Amino acid sequence: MQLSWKDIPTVAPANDLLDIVLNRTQRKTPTVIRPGFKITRIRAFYMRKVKYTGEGFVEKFEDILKGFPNINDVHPFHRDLMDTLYEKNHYKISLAAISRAKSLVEQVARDYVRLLKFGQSLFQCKQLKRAALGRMATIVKKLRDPLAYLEQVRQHIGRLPSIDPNTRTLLICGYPNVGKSSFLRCITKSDVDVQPYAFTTKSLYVGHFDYKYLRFQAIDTPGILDRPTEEMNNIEMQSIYAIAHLRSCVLYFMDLSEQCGFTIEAQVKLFHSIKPLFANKSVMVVINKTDIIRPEDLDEERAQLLESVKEVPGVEIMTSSCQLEENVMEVRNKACEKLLASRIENKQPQARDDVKRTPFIPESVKNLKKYDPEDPNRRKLARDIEAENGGAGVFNVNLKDKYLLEDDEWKNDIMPEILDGKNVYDFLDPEIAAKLQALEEEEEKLENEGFYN
Amino acid sequence: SLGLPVGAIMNCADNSGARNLYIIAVKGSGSRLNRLPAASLGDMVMATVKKGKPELRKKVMPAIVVRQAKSWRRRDGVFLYFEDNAGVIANPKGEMKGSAITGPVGKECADLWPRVASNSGVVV
């Protein structure tokens, strides 16, 4: 899988794992066997115990193998990141050694099970089982160092970032201590240390922010020193790999000030030598700490170096600062516009002659005041009544008696709905005398018609 | 009163149309010695498509029962039942595959499955 494989079961060291397996085998299997028991039963019991131990070991090893991220072919960016973090060759060799140990355990268990079914004396079966257990322990014993290294890398791999390069992304990069970490903290709702040293954000922290109704993620990295492409550290190698593999332009930062005490010529030369990384990214350049420099008041010789930056096609020089973040809005807007342009370039009513209507928003809603939840001076919001009443557990909703009718006495009157005959609703109508005035005449004309005498 | 037992060949109730379905399994069944699962009205069950669309055949999908056909004592004292057993098919979240339904649906199943209620016009 991808995206934070932390779900690995954080296997215990070799000694602890072996102790756990042995305890499980002892607990989950019978123990009291006697010489007087039939040879077949004793052999079956010993074979069952050996098979249970072997199956437990095999299941543990298989789960360990499966839980790993399957570095091979997973992704070039992820593969390079894992290689830098954990020295891919060693990790692959450790996994191969674990697989070989599992195969050896399987073979040993099978061989001992095949041999175990022929021992006659109970002592012979006991010795065979002990030899099988010793062989399994010896096989597991040599696995201590690979298991410990895998546990360490898992402890580190679980907390690694989780981003898809194929998605739309914009990154921030530049010299360390340029305020890049502060820019990342301000631009997106992410918390990162802003301490003033050249390795503040050692790890590649991931930031997320939304613009134009779309999510735009970002990453952080301290950048690159002189680094003539022969002597590079793991942290800088990770940044180089990320810049190479990642999607649309990463923002290049430059501290045009006394801080970051490398001559601006060195900063220009860094990006000039890194130019091959700008094959199709349409790189953008943002000057940091502009508040205390005002690049407009810059030496002509230094301005020439900045001018040389503009010479390379598809670049821009935007002003930004950390003390005041007003420029961050424009920076993010321009970055998002460029990202959308790059992602895009890769590719009624009919007035039916009769209908008349007006927007029928009721005058009440038109003139009613806007509601404010945080303001104490607001409507009751009888949800509050329920909360103070004890929530829905005991709040007896009583919207009844609070409805519009002719009189306030009808609110509490209990409608009978039954009068010893079929419900009045079938004939419940105002002015019931319409069905009573003629009843007297009907009775009179039925009595005086000779039908009863 | 529980509905059809395990393996009952119930008819489909969706608009896509299917000959029938086989209830290989039940969810939330009352697992008990000698007491087989019995899917009741409104209960989501995993029933294989015994016959129907060529692609739907030979695969199990969550089937939602919409008719019971058996006498069950609702909290209302009336012992109502239906013509025959029928049930729609939907994903585990109740997303019915079809865009409509065939036949009426009961209130008990509609209440538990808002999507099914929205997907039915003749309710109760």
Binding site: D111, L115, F118, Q120, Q124, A131 | -
Partner: protein, 230 residues
């Protein structure tokens, strides 16, 4: 996700007030808890606890001795350095395995009254020329599961064990009819393909086979061990 920040959060909230005090109190109580557990942890647990305590004590003693020694203060070629390293048999008077159940009897026929069958319950090596005869002739049966072709071999020189094919068996004491049967019967002398070591006798005639005696009991173990008779 979110790499080691947890350290950052600890640094921004700083070791919750009771955490340090509770940790110190637990550490102080560790000795008392260990002493109490020395009486608890009954059968099947006290033994393990005592073994662990003994191992820890031995390690502590060996570390203290190393520190004390430190506080006081076979030539090899330049290419081998920095690299990993009266004719009685070694085991005379071997255990007298008797003619007994080891010749296990297997009941034959539907009515078990004419078994006449004997099965050898000891490891035996035959090789390619086994060619099981018709079932009617199986007077003696050596099970396949109990057949081994490669036996462990070692010598008191460099301590290197290498699995090598078994060549043949020459002399099994105690009724060498077992020798004729090819049974291992620890205490036997067997030939082993020593071509791997490549030792060369005088005259340039490289040797590739020597007779070795089985040291371990293959009957009670799933592996065969032997020592080169050099």
């Amino acid at each position: 996700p979110q790499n080691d920040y947890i350290e950052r959060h600890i640094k921004q909230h700083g070791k919750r007030l009771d955490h340090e005090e509770r940790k110190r109190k637990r550490e102080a109580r560790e000795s008392h808890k260990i002493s109490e557990r020395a009486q608890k942890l009954t059968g099947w647990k006290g033994k393990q606890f005592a073994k662990k305590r003994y191992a820890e004590k031995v390690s502590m003693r060996k570390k203290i001795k190393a520190h004390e020694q430190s506080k006081v203060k076979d030539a090899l070629p330049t290419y081998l350095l920095d690299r990993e390293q009266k004719f009685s048999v070694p085991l005379p008077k071997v255990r007298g395995i008797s003619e007994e159940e080891m010749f296990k009897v297997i009941k034959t026929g539907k009515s078990r009254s004419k078994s006449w069958k004997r099965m050898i319950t000891k490891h035996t090596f035959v090789g390619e020329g086994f060619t099981r005869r018709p079932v009617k002739m199986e007077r003696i049966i050596r099970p396949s599961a109990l057949r081994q072709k490669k036996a462990n071999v070692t010598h008191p020189e460099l301590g290197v064990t290498v699995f090598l094919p078994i060549l043949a068996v020459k002399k099994n004491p105690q009724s060498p009819m077992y020798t004729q049967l090819g049974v291992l019967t620890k205490g036997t002398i067997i030939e082993v393909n020593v071509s791997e070591l490549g030792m060369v006798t005088a005259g340039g005639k490289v040797v590739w086979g020597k007779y070795a005696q089985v040291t371990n009991e293959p009957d009670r173990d799933g592996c065969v061990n032997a020592v080169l008779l050099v």
